[PDB]
Amino acid sequence: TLLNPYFGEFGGMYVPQILMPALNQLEEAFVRAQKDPEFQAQFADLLKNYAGRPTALTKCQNITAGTRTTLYLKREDLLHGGAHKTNQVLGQALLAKRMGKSEIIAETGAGQHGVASALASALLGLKCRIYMGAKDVERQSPNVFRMRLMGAEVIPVHSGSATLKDACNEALRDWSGSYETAHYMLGTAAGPHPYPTIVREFQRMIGEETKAQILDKEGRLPDAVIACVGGGSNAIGMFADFINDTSVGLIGVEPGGHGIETGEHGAPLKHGRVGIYFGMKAPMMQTADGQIEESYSISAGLDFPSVGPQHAYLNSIGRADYVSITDDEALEAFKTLCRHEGIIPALESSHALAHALKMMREQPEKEQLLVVNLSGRGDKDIFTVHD
């Protein structure tokens, strides 16, 4: 390979021999694209004039009144599609086109990656094939219909536990016999190399914009940037430009579900075991036997039963810190931002806010400059929180 497939112990290319040429191909296309000023301007144009880049950095004043915390929110909820996922698929879709590919294969749980993959393809003239576990299809009528209305073919996977897990399986299964004409648009900063590196690189805007934004508004870098961690794409996009800035804390937040103690969570990086799955070596929701388990969370979007290898690596060397937030805690941060700031946050992002809210409340007298990545809009969750 042209690049390192590992982040210390984590990462790799654990796919059947048959998909290896499809991974080496993708990698070269990325190294080339990355050095291509013509690709760079095409991607910057789409991000800007089509997606809404650059997104806002909002100072939340009402929320932090009566404390020494100054909180800002990277407004990825204002991006087209309502989530940071859009940045990614645009760049991956152009990569598919650069590769002469004219077909897209996608994986989706909550529906968000599917909707973003579907919109990118509609815009770029790619034919879109999307895979969703039957349990999620029934569970996500709105997103399924949104996907279909965008010209995408939605295929339910009744195999296994019929969720993200098995969807990711049918995707690779399909990709093994179609990589020659189709590109598999993986939805997070995980999976086999070159995906964890590609997704980061295509989500880097977030952190890069935040740095310039905070330097403008405050003349200082933040004390810490916080982001939820489902598979790791929005988090890594926030972290990236700040990794070499050792004075800036990187905090990833994993779902705690009903409580870590209950075993009803989606916190593999911190409370799971390292295993090998989905073409990767990474922490995992595993049984004692090594059978893959499901991740639980009030927010469907944080259901990836694993986590990106770069996070596992940053955690191990002490560069980044990972914590967890329960459902009730995320529900509280959700409710709070609605009432004091007038912003409806995704329950996914609510886990991130909830932690910053804790950092504040537990130590109201600590001077602190915080930036939470509001990776998405919460209109989606109005019904869930309602019931």
Binding site: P16, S161, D166, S176, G275, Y277, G279
Partner: protein
């Protein structure tokens, strides 16, 4: 050196090897043991056994359900190795290969997994989701415990892959008939790859994927392959006769007889 002897013996008979595949514990442990004995009795030269996994990403619908049925029966990896020991206690010379997924072998230590194979009498292990690029630790652990590391040679392989597979592999080279996943649903000119592999002193090649008819195995042998592996065609018979175990065996018998005869 179970594979060494089988192939040498098969050659003296100018014969091809017919190797069926099944999932351990499908549809039940007891019926599965019974199936395997029927497979051997009807003429199978070697065996390819899969231990139930929750995410068989290189398997088509037929075997996906074999895993689902095995799971529904409560079959675990521990229960599998138990099954393997009895099979070896019953059949001393037949080569036994395991179709494995990475996590199941990395779970409780890679080294420890291969020691178990040696203890149980397993002959080879193919980890479906580990390419040559990532096989170093698996290869090493296998060799150390007298287990042959099986490598997949895809139809699109370049000289470098071929030379790699030949050097690292042992027992037999898994020649991929097709692209895609395991399925009798679709069929699959391996002449150049087989000559090249023979040129590099690779392990005898066994063609797998889509092989479901007597004519397919004779064709495999004619091209220069030492044999053929067939799974979905076998598993489809188990799937077919779930409500009639006795019928299952008799039908499994007729199929593998037809198949073995075609390699002679």
């Amino acid at each position: 050196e179970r594979y060494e002897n089988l192939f040498a013996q098969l050659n003296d008979r100018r014969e091809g090897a017919f190797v069926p595949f099944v999932t351990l514990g499908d549809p039940g442990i007891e019926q599965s043991l019974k199936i395997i004995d029927t497979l051997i009795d009807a003429g199978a030269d070697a065996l390819e056994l899969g231990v139930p996994f929750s995410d068989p990403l290189a398997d088509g619908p037929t075997i996906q359900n074999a895993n689902l049925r095995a799971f529904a029966a409560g079959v675990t990896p521990a229960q599998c190795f138990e099954m393997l020991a009895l099979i070896r206690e019953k059949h001393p010379t037949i080569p036994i290969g395991l179709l494995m997924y990475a996590n199941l072998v990395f779970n409780n230590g890679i080294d420890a997994f291969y020691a178990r194979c040696e203890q149980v009498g397993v002959d080879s292990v193919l980890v479906a989701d580990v390419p040559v690029e990532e096989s170093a630790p698996f290869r090493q652990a296998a060799l150390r415990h007298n287990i042959a590391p099986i490598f997949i040679c895809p139809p699109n392989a370049d000289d470098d892959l071929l030379r790699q597979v030949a050097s690292y592999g042992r027992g037999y080279t898994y020649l991929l008939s097709r692209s895609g996943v395991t399925g009798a649903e679709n069929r699959g000119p391996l002449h150049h790859l087989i000559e090249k592999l023979k040129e590099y002193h690779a392990a005898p090649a066994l063609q797998g994927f889509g092989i479901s008819s007597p004519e397919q195995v004779s064709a495999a042998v004619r091209a220069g392959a030492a044999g053929a592996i067939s799974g979905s065609a076998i598993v489809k018979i188990i799937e077919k006769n779930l409500a009639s175990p006795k019928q299952m065996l008799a039908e499994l018998r007729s199929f593998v007889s037809a198949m073995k005869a075609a390699s002679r």
